[PDB]
Design a protein around this ligand. Structure first.
Ligand SMILES: [N+]
Ligand SMILES: [N+]
Ligand SMILES: [N+]
Ligand SMILES: [N+]
Lengths: 330, 330, 330, 330
């Protein structure tokens, strides 16, 4: 018998519509409901027994921490049901990478959780969403998908939710990871070539069920002639930790260092990421004396991903050395 | 009888030093003088007559707008001299991509200007700097290099200064461009496979000789649950233009749109870039009604690149349609 | 008024059909005619006045030199007509890269010639062919496309016919170039970022009109424990030149060197390419003494592209030093 | 008290020497002895106790099947010894990817086996070999390296020996894999981001101790207007299996199909690979009816990689369904 898969719809370009078939870049996100999304891929019925549920209808650049929590807690509920074998989430692409990393850290289940979007609205010619959705249900349907962490299925690939990032605009190959795809999905079949090495889902020390609301964490960008202005304003407005999106290896301008020392003395966690996001990672004590200043290094995680990990980490700890540990395992 | 090449030293990792040969990532930048960089590559003498000049000695994450104007001016002086065939600038890698684009925009010469750094200090084993310096002089020595715009020579490649970006940390292949290298340099010899399509150097409408002050331009990051806080703070502290580093196709959160509209009415330019920096570009009037709000789209340029262009363009105009034209040509 | 564009159909996956919408990889190529291809993109009518012509209906792995010549000569005829502004060729993907380089070398016109395929048959869900075709007619329609060489429009990119290669199986981003795309096509609009630097079309020394039939040229693969067997068999069966697909930098096994010396003494041109095809290029006199042995080096061209250039070159010359020149300009 | 690491020297560019420091691409391989390679990196002594042993001194394009069996046997001997914690093999880059996959298949140990070369001779300026050697010993020294399969450490990366391929000529980043690096090595320290999903070393059904002869396996290239000539010649000269390096998804020309059917009836295995080697894989029964012809598909493996697997698999089986299973697991 077919697996039981629930599609949780959250909006996005995959649910969007444009004026004509020629409109693949200019359209409205989050205009179509989950039942109409489902009826557009009749071939779904042959993969799984599927049901749809509209959680929200948003354009994903306008997502809030509360939306995240509400999504997280609805996933946890479905994962708890015997009636559910896998979960597919349809999501806008802009912050898909943030939602997928969140769910990877806090859902303690090894049922397949698959996040899926599209780079063209369903009304464009050569719209990518139908096969992307098919593939998502195909991977969520598969017993081989269990225990692999949160997965995203776009462009015929199986990408890890941890480190897949929207790296290329316009094109359907928008999502890349520095460490490669985990496998591919072709004609309903999954093919695996690599496994995750970082902690996730069922071996996570975090749990969406214990989390009532997330700490405020914000990101400041760095570049030539940058001042401490945005750093202090964000901290003043209540940020519990600041992600520093540095040049190069999380480097900090000499004019900004003292602001960060004092912000740290005042209890704000300082996490050194970078805007050098195709590969490599930020080294502890290389650019700055992190031990001396009690700063944390975000390893390979880009700024918007380092924010998600910091938020979740800080529901359990505000020890800087523990936060570094967490940035080195997850 | 060889070409005459001036090396302008500004500091950086090429001039950096570490504790041992094993220290390829933990070291101090800007430790060695230009005369020592040159003496360390005696083979330079077969490529050209080289003289060195120490302009500054900085780690490139700490560069200021004055540093830029002082470098640009010294480059213009040297380019005017007849005893100068080519110019090589040694630079730290962190903001190398910012200086390179700046000089591409404001040096109205077609003499070769070559910016070069290194990903390893010269004390580390397998240091990349000696060969990078050698290739920089080889490219600047070459008449084929003239009229190509500013060039950067690392990793055996000839990259365009316009859109080469530090994309990968730690590794020697740090610098990539979405549109590919222009050619390669192998054993003193240059090989070309593409030409620039964008306006630069001699056909730029900008001239460093007519620029003695640059306007303040700052960058704000966008992500899930971002607020208008950093945008407002940056504007209050003097930003004449804001580079919005948006998710996706320069998308703007629903709760940041109102503050952006207001900052534009108060006269600060709103330039929509993105943190999706491996390929593609941000399309005018797709995510936001730019025409209606009088905002500008940064095309394919990443946030720090779009800062450099906005800063140079606004020495000459504050019309937003002029600004959009410039972002579509350079 | 609209430009006049002719679509020459040659078969391929873009004209293919599968059993169901789920069949994106298992289908029949070259099953649909050009008039039905045209009727499936009604939006074409708004770009150009288009007419279709079925030149052949093949799967492109089974193309012959005669097919190439017949295609080449029909293009030349259309390019000569006042009634024709641009030409689009629909082609299977397997040898698309070979046809596109051929046309780049021998069509002396600067009217837009656009080659286009698809990685999924038109019957698959999320089939890429409709937008690919649209984009092809959009680029062929555009006066800015003139004088750029032969172009291929897939995956929203504008790729050079010279060095675009099918590099990735299954995925719609199959086609890559070592030197980057030239630009992109979005919603009918073209955006350019680079220009060609190698000789082509209107500045080619070759001309399809003088060519009655092509020399036989064949390719032998190299690897550990390879013998001279395939090299001698191909030469014996009448190959006028052999493309050596070497390991690394066109390297030749010591057991195979004498076979190649003698084959050269016997009049067979020896052209050193490689199966190291993501980037870089083969250097003359690095791996082997090419001057000594009178061999030719294929520069950056992969084996199937080096074959196309050798065939066309040899309709004008059998001088090895001239052949090297040609491999360094085209 | 440090780990005990044996360096097995086989020659190659790491041991190569050129005329001057500027000679990074024009030089002789296999000139320097293992004792000199080691003496040249005194820092190795902080990582482990190293002893060197010169196994051969070859340029890697000239390697034979005996060379492979002799290396594999010597590796098995050393792996059995208790005085040996890790094994480093210095190798030329040309067929490095072939030896690495061979050892991955037949060494039934989980001690670290690390293969390393260099893209520049050790006499050239900015030679990559010293740091590559250092990192190889650092990775082999590390208990975290055990059970990972054969590893290759170049360009600061830890690449899987299974699917790492020499993909880019000249440049230091020559070796890539479609599925990404497993991790990185920075300043002696290893960082992991992915694990192998494929069978290897200790869970291989193959054992070098039970292999004293390898069957003859050869590769034919496919392209436009290819004939059955090289296929037939290779089979006549002793090939027990043919790797067909097809266009696209291992596609076979219409005029080569009949000769392949006949060669299979005569008992030579037909393995469909491709020269589309950046990503994707060749799908059974898509391009050709493999079931009906009793052919095998090489999955994601490139032609020279599929040669190594077919050669090892056929020491144990000649059933084609067994052969397909093996190509789907290793
Ligand atoms: N969006
Ligand atoms: N730095
Ligand atoms: N095909
Ligand atoms: N070699």
């Amino acid at each position: 018998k077919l697996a039981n898969v629930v599609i949780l719809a959250t909006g996005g370009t995959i649910a969007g519509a444009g004026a004509s078939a020629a409109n693949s870049a200019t359209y409205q996100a989050a205009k179509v409901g989950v039942d109409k999304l489902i009826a557009g891929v009749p071939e779904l019925a042959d993969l799984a027994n599927v049901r749809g549920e509209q959680v929200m209808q948003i354009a994903s650049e306008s997502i809030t921490n509360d939306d995240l929590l509400k999504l997280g807690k609805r996933v946890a509920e479905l994962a708890d049901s015997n009636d559910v074998d896998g979960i597919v989430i349809t999501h806008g692409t802009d912050t898909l990478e943030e939602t997928a990393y969140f769910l990877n850290l806090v859902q303690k289940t090894d049922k397949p959780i698959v996040v899926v979007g599209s780079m063209r609205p369903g009304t464009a010619m050569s719209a990518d969403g139908m096969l992307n959705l098919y593939n998502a249900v195909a991977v969520a349907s598969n017993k081989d998908s269990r225990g692999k962490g949160v997965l995203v299925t776009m462009n015929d690939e199986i990408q890890s939710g941890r480190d897949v990032s929207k790296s290329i605009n316009i094109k359907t190959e928008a999502f890349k990871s520095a460490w490669g795809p985990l496998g591919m999905v072709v004609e309903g079949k999954s093919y695996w070539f690599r496994l995750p090495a970082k902690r996730h889902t069922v071996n996570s020390e975090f749990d969406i069920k214990q989390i009532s609301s997330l700490p405020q964490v914000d990101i400041a960008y760095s570049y030539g002639n940058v001042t401490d202005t945005a750093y202090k304003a964000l901290a003043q407005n209540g940020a519990k930790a600041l992600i520093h999106a540095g040049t190069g290896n999380g480097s900090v301008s000499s004019r900004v260092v003292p602001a960060l020392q004092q912000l740290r003395k005042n209890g704000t966690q300082i996490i050194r990421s970078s805007h050098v996001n195709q590969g490599g990672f930020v080294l502890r004590n290389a650019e700055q004396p992190d031990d001396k200043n009690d700063w944390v290094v975000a390893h390979d995680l880009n700024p918007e991903k380092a924010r998600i990990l910091a938020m979740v980490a800080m529901t359990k700890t505000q020890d800087s050395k523990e936060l570094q540990r967490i940035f080195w395992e997850y």
